[model samples]
Target: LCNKQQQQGPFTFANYQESPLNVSRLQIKVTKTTVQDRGKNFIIGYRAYWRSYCYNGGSLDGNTGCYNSLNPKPPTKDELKTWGQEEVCYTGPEVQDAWSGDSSICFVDWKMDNKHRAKELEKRSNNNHFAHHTCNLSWRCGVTNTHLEVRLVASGTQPQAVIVMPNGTTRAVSMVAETFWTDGEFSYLYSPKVFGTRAETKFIPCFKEEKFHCKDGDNFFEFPSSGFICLPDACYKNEKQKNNLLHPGMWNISEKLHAASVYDVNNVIHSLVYETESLRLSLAQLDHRFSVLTKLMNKMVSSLAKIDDRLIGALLEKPMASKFISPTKFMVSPCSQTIDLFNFKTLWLPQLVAAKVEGVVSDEDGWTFVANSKQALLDTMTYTKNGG
Candidate 1:
């Protein structure tokens, strides 16, 4: 079971509780934080490599995929509105290629390990033999590999294993292919470009390599490797593989890095949307308060008006002039009245009798008393007018 295994399809099985599919070590090299500056053209890329199975073996079909990532260019004046329409999108922290769309399948990977791994061409284990092994991958990253669709093969007829070069030529890694099941070597070099200048001479990836040198970053850009595998669109026969390929998961160097610029603008747009919602709520509350205040004012004014009307009705029902003479039931003699009216105490008497008294008067308080004829006559006339 361990030695003579062949993959059912170009793809491998998923990890299960009991059995796990065979997967190669996925090595990633990326850079540190690099901010995007205004007007700078930023690019992110990668260089990847892998070994190969003999073309002669056909145990299970296999392919290997690598990625090439280019920093997204700033949106043109025309393209600015699209956001991620033709651009990439993620909800953060988890970087992914956007769709099953063509932009992601940059380079491909294919492999075969005769002992445990199966080659598209053949397989061998415990004196058992099979052919047609397959190792498959399709990913895209930072830069290089101008021939985006060609498969680099290790046999007599396919393209060279290495993908890209400054000149038109591709160099192959010296591979060990003495037998049908023998394993071979592969290597590639990638350098991200900036403002039309690349940091290194190599750009392509490969399937077989004898000599190679490299070091590398999500933070890193990616590019597809060049090698013999299926073409880009055809590599994924099964739709489920698409999930693994999409969303290869930033920014740096000041020639106009657009990612950070995009990052800030995207954040701003989201924040504005949030602020607008809060403002709407605030406006609603203010209007409600205004309505409540208007009702309160109206009730207060109506209640005040009712009080005034009631008072006026009472005042109009009776005349004050006719009642003036007897406003009080009693009055004092003129001498006492003068004292009391000026704040001196005096004894009291009936006002009508006192007013009609013709001459002098005395107070019961044992003080001398007199009457005023003019004042008594005025009071006596008001009492007669009232039909006394």
Candidate 2:
């Protein structure tokens, strides 16, 4: 019942005469779903945006699933402990389960590991209450004369809603049906036939001798992104887990999203050294066009350096201040993953655009751009000894 325009269903309310409140239910239905043709060779498409929120205990601090309701409360804390610290063993090998096509699953032997993730998920289940997502129910579908008939036998002495076809059909069945549905531990019910196009349904790392150097049977960590792995770090307060850096022989296009107007692995720290020394050094000749500002750009370079660097990179929110000042014409977002910070439309901060690759995607859009600062150039001309 919110004023959300993109929503696909209508909200209806009714008061029954002498009706049993516990047995009564609500149903919602939608149909005629259209295939939006975003022309591309790929079977599926994605228009993604980023969102972040407070996290309590886990190393990752953001929620990816797009869901929120306005309630004021700090995040909940979950305890952490591990077992079988000395050795790793496999207790079970099986296919991970999920109820939706867009879902992912990972299965590891839990016999000696931290309290199994499955047990944690079970504890969080809300029984005899209104459910937030459609994946919570087990219902079969039948096609009627005109449409698909999705029936639900409600269980428990409560009123609830259920999820149905892509058109979003839902209904309120009797209370007993709702109870019967949730009583048992149901394995994940994912239909590969339903969402195979837009989802990756499986993951298994293969033996690549060139990739993981160790000969021990222990499988090296493999993740979605290539060429980078996690390592221990002590650089920041909240981030105690290991950080990721570029592996040798790997040129990252992933971090390209984070290339901003001023800060980067090459320039952020080195800019300071070059500016302070102001010498006829040989290394400065490599990209000597940037040589003019090497003298007078310390504060600007240093300010730019203060921007937090991200490798598994994303911007949760804009920092309160920019690292550089007025002489810099634009602001760049130091993020690898593209983020849509809840605003309906996106405004590309030009400083970020300047850093992007030109022609295909502007340096302003992807990574490198020259700021127009004639005055700063004039100031640094003294150190350059007449634009050497």
Candidate 3:
């Protein structure tokens, strides 16, 4: 008897139990056997927070289903708002199932004569386990009247906990049953069907693509914020095959690369490479602009040369020279994908390519002809030293 909250039948509850298996979420499971007192079979329900707006999850915001939430306050009716009350959440027992308006408040129709029977009223655990949250199984209702009972069986004997994936791949955990329930290979996770208005149940299991093949599918691993996670036969078996299923994804070399030391060095390289590359491209672009302007000046010089001899005085000491000089140095990503380095930071220093465009040039020649007039005066001076 791990819990005995308020009373037995009126309503008793235990705070939500937590789930991690690496995925954060909550489990809300409570069970009982009841013989209706004037058709009043005690309600088997969940006290979950309901929300109309979509939670972006993790309960990071105060209202991701409002379970251990920090997103903000509950939605009020007249809070001076532009949005409707559908934007917030409140906790209750009207918990809903994913994909439908199904309620978590369940009852086993004992249509037959009232016999002493222990029945099952398990909700699909794949509901409300994704979106912006992962909660702890803290709110569980209890049973009373001796006409009913509730629990996860005893923990000492039925103590081990694990996950048996579809491919017979089993990953074991310490133990957890007084919190979650299982039926053969099928088990149900729990959640509170949030919000009173028009917010639908949110479950995340399939690929984001519409054309992709998937579902919460026959799937019964239920964690409030976890997509597909439930308990398997936790009987303490499979002594050896344990090493393989958890083997493939846990790459030995890969984990070593996430070190802070490696990340720091990788960042240093990134900063250095990007900085140098950017500077080089800017330098190259400016060179191109200078060359362009210089060539224009060259063209003007040649054009003025056409104004020679008499208009060009007697002794032109120095001729203005210019050239149609050809320009060369013109100027030119962290990248879209990650490039592996020594199977390390799998990070490049941005491997940035130095490219520059219009690196953030000019003037008219004194309305265009000042240079020409000034050169004309200089030419006259050169011609008359002593009429030499």
Candidate 4:
């Protein structure tokens, strides 16, 4: 037997006498048997580690020593203390399954249980035929566990160890049994009820209006940060026909196109083209209106020569001209005849001279008239002569 540790049951070898020549295989299955507490717990499953020894000829010989003789043995107790190991995962109520709870029926393989058995010598052919086989199984609780039991059963023949239990109870020779019992004294320890807490995931949008219809209503196109959907079983057959409607390989091509980052490039181009076209049309209309205003301003300034001629003629006419022309200063300065013509030239001047004949015509009204008439005559002559 293997080294026995902190447990009530003594290790024993499986019965190998009934079928000495028949090849037999042993398999172990375990399940959560009882709940020590009736409260919420995170006991997902058990983590099982097993070590085995074979008795080929005698007690301590070649390829036959006690503690963990398998080619790759499970982690030792010290290793478990120093480093953690893989889990044999099971489920509880937190799982999405409908029947998941602390006592819900579920189990998983022990270490090396799913591996192929090493080729060994048979009883009649090879000298290393084992007379008995003893394996020691240990448990380090998973995320959660209360009490658990392992059942060892003959996978093929009855000479194999059938249902071995925690209290050193073994079922009668059978392939499988429907019952289990965890004796109070030998029941596996109920690890502290671990409560698993998961932080809820929060997804934030990168921008507003990022989600839109895509793939013709089959799916939606969301922000790139949002997750993608994959269809592992996208192929389905035509209901009316007995043939395959879509092969998985062809459907995979379609999925590849949708998942590719470049697939949306064309969609982006279409949207930009439509918006750019509308803007260009509006700009062209605005340009046409501005061109029309420019032409109307040019037409209004077309008859500018006629306007200049009329302005010059009005400057040379009667009442307006008298306000500017006077003979007093321009015609009266040097000779008496010139001065006489200036005195008689205007109605306002004759009345002023008759009232008072001054010694010299250096008064305000006389010189002012002379300066104004001179400038007016010169300006009119220059403008008309130059084709104003």
**Local distance difference test, per candidate?**
0.26, 0.24, 0.28, 0.28
Which regions in candidate 4 have their CA more than 4 angstroms from the true location? 1-129, 132-261, 302-388
Select the stronger candidate by lDDT from 1 and 4.
Answer: 4
Comparing 3 and 4 on TM-score, the stronger one? 4
lDDT of 4 by residue, 137-200 (tens): 2222222222222212222211122222223344442223222222211111222233211122
| Alpha-carbon deviation at 174 in model 4, angstroms | 49
lDDT of 1 by residue, 1-388 (tens): 3756665567866753644544322332321112112321211122122211112134344422222222212222222212212232111011122222322222222221112111111111111123322222211211212111111322332223232222233334223320011111111221222211111222222122232222221011232332112221111111233223332111111212112467776898999899999989989987998999879775654455354434323444532212112322322222134444566467643232111111111221101100222233234334211100
Tens-digit per-residue lDDT, 1-388, candidate 3: 5665555565667664644343323222211111112222112211122122223345565554422221112212222121111222122222233222222132222122211112111121222545532212111111111111111111222222232222333333222221233322112222112211121233333322212222232322222221212122101112132222221111122222123477877998999999999999999987998998889765654455344312222223433322222332111101099877667454433222332221000012111122343343344334211100
Please, what is the TM-score per model? Answer: 0.15, 0.12, 0.16, 0.19
- Alpha carbon lDDT of residue 281, candidate 3? 99
So what's the TM-score on candidate 1? Answer: 0.15
Sort every candidate by TM-score, greatest first. 4, 3, 1, 2
Clashing pairs in 4: 43-144
Per-prediction CA RMSD (Å): 51.4, 39.9, 41.1, 51.9
Quick one: best TM-score, which candidate?
Answer: 4
TM-score of 4: 0.19
